[PDB]
Subunit: 376 residues, 5 copies
């Protein structure tokens, strides 16, 4: 993930122009090799036309350039790229939202699984660890970074997500299918056991835990589904073929011809196709948007920071359900106890935000006449 | 936020034309500097062509202008801008909907956390304050205005959202990750304690509170996610490059050439490219839509009024759970107690809305024949 | 709201052509003034060119017309209008869906708040009235029609939505922010009181009421949010400027020039720009779609009938929770008690719908071979 | 509804070409009259030009044809049709999803409303019948087919959905608004009564029934909303005007002119405008998509089969809650009781689907090196 | 399903170019027959023009080619294909998400339906089997692969999803409509019976089971709805006609004419229309995207692997509710019990992901001045 939110807080004169100076996660880093290849092919053709071809060969080359320039139809490739890239971007955001987060479960577990003794701590920590373990098993299945961090289940055990006894039970299960779901079943069984032992004090609490477990588990399953059901290969091939067809038509049709021949719209030889290179950057970068986002669990600069999320989720979940269990500051009167109204102070830098009228609704400046307001 | 809803209540002859006279949050305020820069570059080129260049240099300049005018392809930039700006606008609205609001929690707390004594007031106020505190911690993390108002946790304490004892516990937590979630865990623990003490009278009430806490907390988390996962930098760079490429092609290709040379479509010298300036305003403003909306938590005119929302939310939540707790007007018979039907009166200005038929459904004017209506 | 659903039940030969004959909520009613203004400007220019200008002035005018006709680029304005109008239409439907309806609450209240005595009737009627009152307070804040009907809180009291004692409590609340939410807090308190008194017989019933109260209250809040957060002014200005730029280019470039001058594509003088007028109707009407829908709570023909909805909602809610409480027809055997199957009769006009095969699924005509169906 | 799912199970060489041979619900059936009218107007103009007009009149006609052919701008009409038709299609699917189905309620009622005696059967059947009755009342309000089947409430009574006593109560209710919601209030009251009598054994069961009742009732309400709030008439008029403007420009500008006059791009007289007729079919059919779908509750071939759904829903709901109540096959061990794993057999026709590797995740072929996998 | 997620983990120099080398689920496999047919027709016309036609016939053929090349309007077909294919792709993903999965139910059943004895195992296995059976009945109704695997209900019985006694009850039900829903009613009855016998220990548990049953059943129903309500046939016909019209215009208008005739833009005879073939591949493949996805339950390479999902779902559900019931590893202290913080180790290949700063929010680099931060 390349975060530039702070740079674009305000619409400024520099605006996105300053974003054009960034390298990490940039169009430049993704496209410079393809740009050099396109320029190399173009300049090889230009050099052959200028120095190698005979007069007859040059005349035929000019006819082919004029013919090919007709098929450089940008409007259709723009259509398909717009639709396809928008599909990939929407799917990318949907995939991010399917990342399993323990926050809802950790709040419910902290509020529902009780006891300051070691057994209560074991119940809470084990429930949150099962959630973390499911997340790790699915992520190592779908994320190259996570897999490289956990290339075998032995690494999951050594990392503390799974115990050796848990690993014995996990491997003894006869299944040819991915077992990311197993810790969710463990969670359900352990929650039922906690309710049976009175650690969960009510049936409604157990229902809430199971409701939140299924939300978490469904997010894990959604990651599996996105990983399995690629964007249809035919669609990806269609868009790639359209883009490369346009690039072929430009590579031939955008050649600078001898101005002496006096061909229509060929009277200037700049020797470098500046606007064609800008068009190539535009269109190829537009497709590179999809190329980077189509699998966001790789190691691209703008791919999701899955290992960071595993670490954050585990650390925060353990804090919430172990260190913060029943550890409230004493109930005390707040600063605004004696004030019927309340408003926090403003800094010198933000007090200007005051004196903007408190919006009440769009209708409170109509100012009707007396006779109009009387009920029938 | 620049609210103009009242101005556009009706489709009028003036309509959006009157909106063209607004300055705050306007295209003009966002784009006048870029418009002056574009006009300056254009007029510098025009002045060099008219007064500096020699005849040969002028002929070459005319060839370059004619060549460059071919690549001013507006249709592709329109495509990419449409798709990209629509993505940014949808994301902007989604981000607004993720703003944490205490209204659902304040209704549930007012209805479920009981006692007119000081301890009941402490429970209700502390629960709502925890919600407000989570909102402040995330907003100061994602909003420049809120951060400038709360540049340190000391400011949060002095503003009354967090207590000194709460601050001690908050800082003692060993976490390298953002702690906006901590008050939600405090809320869960305090709700469990209130249920244990009988302040919350039923398990279903506690479940409802925890359900609403997780909705609120999820909105906080969503703000964090939007702040972290920028719109992919490559996509922003692609659209910016497309727009600036079109601007380069226009800056060269829209130059007024000497009509004496008799170039095709160059026979009028207006000395000011009026339609190119209007196109620049159109396209650059279209992108400025995204530039303003890409981070709605800045200090732009149309950015969200986050400090106003913090103040409103805190004040209303405290009113709802403290002043309005168990403070009902006595149950009394309403004006329409003795009327089988009921309808409120209309004013002289609105009685015309009556005599419009009460819509019953689209099918109640078919008026079939007698023989058609008989069951088989 | 202009309902034409009945006219378009079937795709007919007349089809939408007949819709072109409608006036209420029509393109004609919204655009005839702008059409006359455009035609007036066009004909003023035409008259000046034909009768006022000298020969030299006419030649310069012809050059300006030919120059301006080049910038009448409809493809870009089509893009921006498509994206912007689609955004406004989607937002319009979303706003309609945020209209608070008491139906869910009235069903729950009728089923959960018990007693045929006056006190039960008071509880049920007061709960539904609180819902209605919240809807009225928000609608009068966001709707010009509703505001004109309830220009002051005194009108809300005289209309029966709020009692005088309720008004005393309502005004005594020290809040600078809109108080539409207050009756929802009253509802929560009154539901808690009803549960405490045994009028609500179970905790799950109270939870259901509070769950439905928050859905209703959230819809009220959503109306406030839509009213406050306009479609970004910059975007509206951009689309308006694009449309008016195209109109300027057409007003100059579509002038009929003297055919004697023999300009390319200027050999016919129809004296009335029929196709330009049709294009103006098309594009200006396309934008008028957004102009009408951007604020659907005004007094346009196709704006929402908010006063009708207030009346319907109040009347139906009171019927449901008061007249229909515990007023069931005696449980009796239905017409199909003794029939294992069942099907209602068809009329002579609809019996043709029978003899269409009952769809079972797409796979039930594959008709595989014997050898293929045997399990391995 | 015209179901062709079976014909398009696989992408085949014939593919959609075979779909071009279908008549029911076809473009041909919807558009042949308009195609004949367009061809008649075109051929009338052609005949007048070829046989009636004088030489001078023919020269003026040629100038008008050349002028009109310039305004046949397909790109703008394509834009507006794309956006508008996509809106109508999305709304069409949304409306289908709002069709009230009793399946969720019938499962809950079968599982929660108890007793094999006549009184239990009466409770279950009456609850499901109330759901069916609400569906019939709304559908007869919004569907021409259903209305023709139930043109009066007397038909609803004779069909068995409503009883005579129920009809007395239904008509005695003083409401000027549609009463489709009344049976939902009856359902709520009857569910409360069943809980009070112990037929519903728990408060959570009653809550579940009321939760599912409100989902069903909300779908009924959504049908009412879609029926009432048409797609804005101005938008429909705008798209229709754009299409008909293009058709006018084609009807004049696509006339075959005398090749002898040697007009540019007029050298071939085919006497039948084949490509213009194909364009008319394309664009007019594109709009006919919306014309058919804008009200899906009519009697078009592809309109929803509402009467079939009423019959299916009633029959299945009665089966589920009456014949299938507490009628389980005895709990017996399944075929895979003694198998730790399990997999159903494959047929000779489907066994080829085996030997495709069981997908485990995208990361399980990375095959890292030994040194890379060691924890830090 | 053709999964290529692993190939596109990173945006690479090869990128989608390497995807152009794939055959299974490729554009090539779907389109080579149509490409050969188009090329055959084109070359037949070319051969007739070059070798069969007389001089007069060749001149007329040249006029027809020039005339037809004018109507090869790609911009409109691009529009309709974009909108239509996007609709089909969104519907395809929606259909995938409606595939019934037992995971949520298996977690709830494992946690709520109790007993290590044979009767508990029978309850859990039978509930999960009912879910699997409903999925099989709907899938065999909508999926050609599943139907070929289960061409009769006898195959469902022999496969173990349905028992012989269950089959007797199933066939005795008098219904002309699809019975996929029957096992869901069986599930509801059996869950009620388990609650009555005390196997389900609480009312909230039973509610949770019924809530998850209805989610599962609704997904089954959604598959039925998608199977029944095809994408409107008129829309499919419109897009197909537009594409084939463009193909006709290209087949005639893209013919290579004799360069000697000196027609404008006809001076090169390549004898093979390379760019027209690439355009045909682009557009025909774009439509083949929809052709494959319109019914994803067929036997295309990229159609859903429904039989694999049936096998996986059944096997995993049985494991979860039978082998894993109350089979927890003993509660033991985790690796991070004594650590206030926690972080799993990194491998040599992934440790580089560390030293990237832990994102705290976009506002934590503003660095305001001292005087600005002071509260008013
Ligand atoms: C034909 C046009 C495309 C040109 C192809 C790209 C050529 C530029 C190569 C840049 C080499 C940077 C290598 C690097 O690894 O250095 C990264 C480092 C951190 O970069 P970071 O802060 O983004 O993280 O360097 C920094 O600090 C900031 C680096 C500044 C980036 C400057 C390059 C972009 C300017 C091109 C303008 C294009 C015309 C519109
Ligand atoms: C340059 C093209 C734009 C022309 C501008 C509009 C000129 C038409 C003015 C119509 C005056 C109607 C005034 C009125 O207030 O009368 C409404 C009344 C109820 O109308 P309602 O039933 O819709 O409710 O009259 C009715 O009954 C039905 C009224 C019939 C409407 C006829 C006007 C539209 C025909 C224009 C064709 C445009 C070419 C495509
Ligand atoms: C006019 C342009 C369209 C040409 C029409 C397609 C002509 C290519 C026929 C390919 C025959 C493969 C037959 C096969 O059944 O073999 C599949 C097997 C597994 O394929 P799999 O790994 O995808 O599973 O073969 C493999 O291993 C990988 C096969 C490699 C595919 C090479 C063909 C595509 C290259 C065309 C380049 C188009 C210009 C842009
Ligand atoms: Ca990637
Ligand atoms: Ca901003
Ligand atoms: Ca309006
Ligand atoms: Ca219809
Ligand atoms: Ca298929
Ligand atoms: Cl619940």
């Amino acid at each position: 993930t390349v975060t530039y939110t702070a740079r674009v807080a305000n619409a400024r004169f520099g605006g996105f122009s300053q974003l054009l100076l960034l390298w990490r996660g940039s169009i430049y880093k993704l496209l410079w090799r393809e740009l050099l290849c396109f320029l190399g092919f173009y300049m090889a053709l230009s050099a052959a036309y200028r120095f190698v071809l005979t007069e007859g060969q040059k005349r035929y080359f000019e006819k082919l350039v004029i013919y090919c320039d007709q098929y450089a139809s940008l409007i259709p490739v723009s259509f398909v790229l717009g639709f396809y890239v928008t599909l990939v971007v929407n799917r990318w955001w949907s995939q991010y939202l399917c990342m399993p987060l323990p926050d809802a479960l950790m709040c419910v577990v902290a509020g529902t699984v009780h006891g300051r003794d070691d057994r209560g701590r074991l119940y809470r920590r084990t429930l949150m660890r099962y959630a973390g373990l499911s997340a790790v098993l699915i992520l190592r299945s779908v994320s190259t970074a996570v897999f490289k961090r956990f290339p075998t289940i032995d690494h999951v055990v050594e990392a503390g997500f799974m115990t050796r006894e848990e690993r014995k039970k996990f491997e003894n299960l006869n299944s040819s299918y991915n077992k990311y779901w197993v810790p969710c079943v463990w969670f359900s069984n352990l929650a039922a056991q906690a309710r049976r032992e009175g650690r969960i004090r009510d049936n409604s609490a157990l229902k809430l835990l199971l409701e939140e477990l299924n939300v978490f588990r469904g997010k894990c399953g959604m990651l599996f589904h996105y990983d399995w059901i690629s964007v249809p290969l035919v669609y990806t091939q269609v868009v790639t073929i359209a883009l490369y067809s346009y690039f072929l038509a430009c590579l031939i049709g955008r050649q600078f011809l001898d101005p002496a021949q006096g061909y229509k719209d060929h009277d200037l030889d700049l020797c470098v196709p500046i606007f064609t290179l800008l068009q190539f950057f535009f269109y190829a970068g537009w497709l590179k948007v999809a190329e980077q986002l189509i699998n966001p669990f790789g190691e691209d600069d703008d791919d999701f920071e899955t290992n960071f999320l595993i670490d954050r989720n585990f650390q925060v979940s353990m804090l919430a359900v172990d260190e913060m269990y029943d550890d409230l500051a004493v109930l005390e009167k707040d600063l605004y106890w004696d004030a019927a109204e309340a408003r926090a102070p403003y800094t010198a830098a933000t007090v200007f935000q005051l004196r903007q009228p408190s919006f009440q609704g769009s209708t409170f400046d109509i100012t009707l006449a007396k006779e109009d307001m009387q009920f029938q």
